[PDB]
Design a protein around this ligand. Structure first.
Ligand SMILES: *[C@@H]1O[C@H](CO)[C@@H](O[C@@H]2O[C@H](CO)[C@@H](O[C@@H]3O[C@H](CO[C@H]4O[C@H](CO[C@H]5O[C@H](CO)[C@@H](O)[C@H](O)[C@@H]5O)[C@@H](O)[C@H](O[C@H]5O[C@H](CO)[C@@H](O)[C@H](O)[C@@H]5O)[C@@H]4O)[C@@H](O)[C@H](O[C@H]4O[C@H](CO)[C@@H](O)[C@H](O)[C@@H]4O)[C@@H]3O)[C@H](O)[C@H]2NC(C)=O)[C@H](O)[C@H]1NC(C)=O
Ligand SMILES: *[C@@H]1O[C@H](CO)[C@@H](O[C@@H]2O[C@H](CO)[C@@H](O[C@@H]3O[C@H](CO[C@H]4O[C@H](CO)[C@@H](O)[C@H](O)[C@@H]4O)[C@@H](O)[C@H](O[C@H]4O[C@H](CO)[C@@H](O)[C@H](O)[C@@H]4O)[C@@H]3O)[C@H](O)[C@H]2NC(C)=O)[C@H](O)[C@H]1NC(C)=O
Ligand code: HEM
Ligand SMILES: [Mg+2]
Length: 335
């Protein structure tokens, strides 16, 4: 009772700004069974009906929604979506939960695979987020007001009351320090190291109304609306261009940092990891995930094997462009 996975959707026909908070996409409250998770973007899209409102969707639905709702760039959408799906989705039913585990993704895969959703900590979701607390403290998915207060503080201190690139640079480093000091299991390597810098600029490039073209900066009201209430600002117009992680290099430059983590279940004991992916060694990330998938799926056969092969190729198509050329791996051979 499986599905044949379609290739990834391409870019939208129209790539300009438009009203996305419109009559066909109203904010609605959560009903019982509806799933939300650590991504404010996907949360908002589900709560406006760009995604299924229950928070379970196909990879193709996620790509279309991120493009339609926010003008997320096509390749960035492919890289993030199939990463999330390979690690956390059900490859047979072609369904991914944007939060925790649910029967809505269908019959479970064979362990060690889990199809447990974007909430699963360790390989995609990780530490030193802006509005979510590290998993060590007990909840890696819920909005956290204490962290949002720090968001506001840093915006007051560095951005005249608004979130801009200067704020992003300072906040990213401070949050890393918070975790070093307080989380003995703190990890900041591989996937998390790369995705964390991109996440800090998404509020600027995607959450700021697209009619704003000079001095792009996010108000705390708009930040609260998306990060906490999963709601587009009134009359929200998406980015006038497809966009992703522009400026992430500047965030790293403001406080140069190396992948690693706290060693030996001890705080204030951050050790570099020289084998981790970084921004000049991106193909390492590709290989780490192919390997993680091999751990989840040690001996797949049948429809599962087929869908794995397809989804792996789909992910490579995005990664190849985004990382500037990586040799494709074939852990389960070819079709
Ligand atoms: C995110 O948000 C933040 C917040 O909104 C934003 O910050 C702004 O960033 C810009 C720069 O990008 C800031 O503007 C710059 O300010 C520099 C520092 O200003 C001080 O020093 C000036 C130079 O000193 C001379 O004069 C003093 C005596 O006053 C003397 O001791 C020195 O020896 C020296 O001779 C000084 O002129 C300036 O005072 C003026 O401005 C203040 C207000 O800031 C005003 O109260 C004064 O009356 C007076 O008008 C101040 O004391 C400054 O050096 C710098 O100038 C360069 O650039 C301009 C053009 O941009 C050139 O004309 C000039 O020749 C220099 O090359 C520039 O003006 C701005 O102040 C920040 N705003 C805030 C609120 O912090 C970030 O940019 C945002 N980040 C992103 C990524 O967007
Ligand atoms: C919302 O998110 C926040 C931020 O993550 C959560 O709050 C944190 O909760 C943890 C767990 O209780 C706190 O951890 C402890 O912090 C000590 C350091 O405190 C200093 O620094 C912080 C900021 O960096 C200041 O707030 C604080 O006043 C101090 O100046 C550590 O020394 C503690 O270590 C002990 O426990 C660990 C774990 O068992 C051991 O490994 C250590 O050896 C040691 O015994 C500890 O880590 C943390 O301080 C909190 N941070 C903040 C900023 O408040 C919220 O719980 C979360 N939920 C909510 C409330 O919405
Ligand atoms: C394309 C598919 C997407 C996937 C699979 C995805 C997945 C994730 C995951 C798993 C996290 C949590 C990582 C963490 O902080 O621990 C996350 C965080 C985040 N995502 Fe997404 N995301 C996607 C698209 C988007 C889009 C389009 C935006 C913006 C419009 C966005 C904005 C964010 C932001 C800002 C965070 C950080 C939240 C915080 O630190 O408080 N994402 N995403
Ligand atoms: Mg996190």
């Amino acid at each position: 009772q499986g599905v044949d996975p379609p290739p990834p959707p391409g870019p939208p026909s129209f790539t300009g700004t438009k009203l996305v908070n419109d009559a066909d996409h109203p904010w609605q409250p959560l009903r019982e069974g509806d799933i939300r998770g650590p991504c404010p973007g996907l949360n908002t899209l589900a709560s406006h009906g760009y995604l299924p409102r229950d928070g379970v969707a196909t990879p193709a639905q996620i790509i279309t929604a991120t493009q339609e709702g926010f003008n997320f760039e096509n390749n960035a959408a492919i890289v993030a979506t199939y990463l999330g799906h390979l690690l956390n989705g059900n490859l047979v039913t072609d369904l991914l939960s944007i939060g925790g585990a649910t029967p809505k993704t269908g019959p479970p895969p064979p362990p060690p695979a889990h199809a447990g959703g974007l909430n699963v900590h360790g390989t995609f979701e990780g530490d030193a987020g802006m509005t979510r607390a590290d998993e060590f403290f007990g909840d890696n998915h819920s909005f956290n007001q204490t962290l949002f207060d720090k968001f506001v503080d840093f915006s007051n201190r560095y951005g005249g009351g608004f979130y801009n690139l200067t704020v992003a640079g300072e906040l990213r480093y401070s949050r890393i320090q918070d975790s070093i000091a307080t989380n003995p299991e703190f990890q900041f390597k591989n996937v998390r190291f790369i995705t964390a810098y991109g996440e800090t600029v998404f509020p600027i490039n995607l959450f700021v109304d697209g009619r704003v073209t000079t001095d792009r900066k996010l108000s705390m009201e708009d930040a609260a609306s998306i990060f906490r209430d999963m709601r587009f600002p009134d009359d929200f117009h998406r980015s006038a261009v497809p966009a992703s992680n522009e400026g992430a290099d500047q965030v790293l430059a403001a406080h140069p940092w190396v992948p690693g983590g706290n060693a030996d279940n001890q705080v204030n004991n951050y050790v570099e990891d020289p084998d981790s992916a970084d921004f000049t060694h991106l193909c390492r990330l590709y290989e780490f995930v192919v390997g993680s998938v091999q751990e989840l799926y040690p001996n797949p056969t049948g429809i599962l094997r087929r869908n794995l092969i397809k989804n792996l190729h789909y992910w490579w198509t995005g990664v190849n462009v985004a990382f500037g050329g990586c040799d494709e791996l074939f852990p389960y051979g070819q079709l």
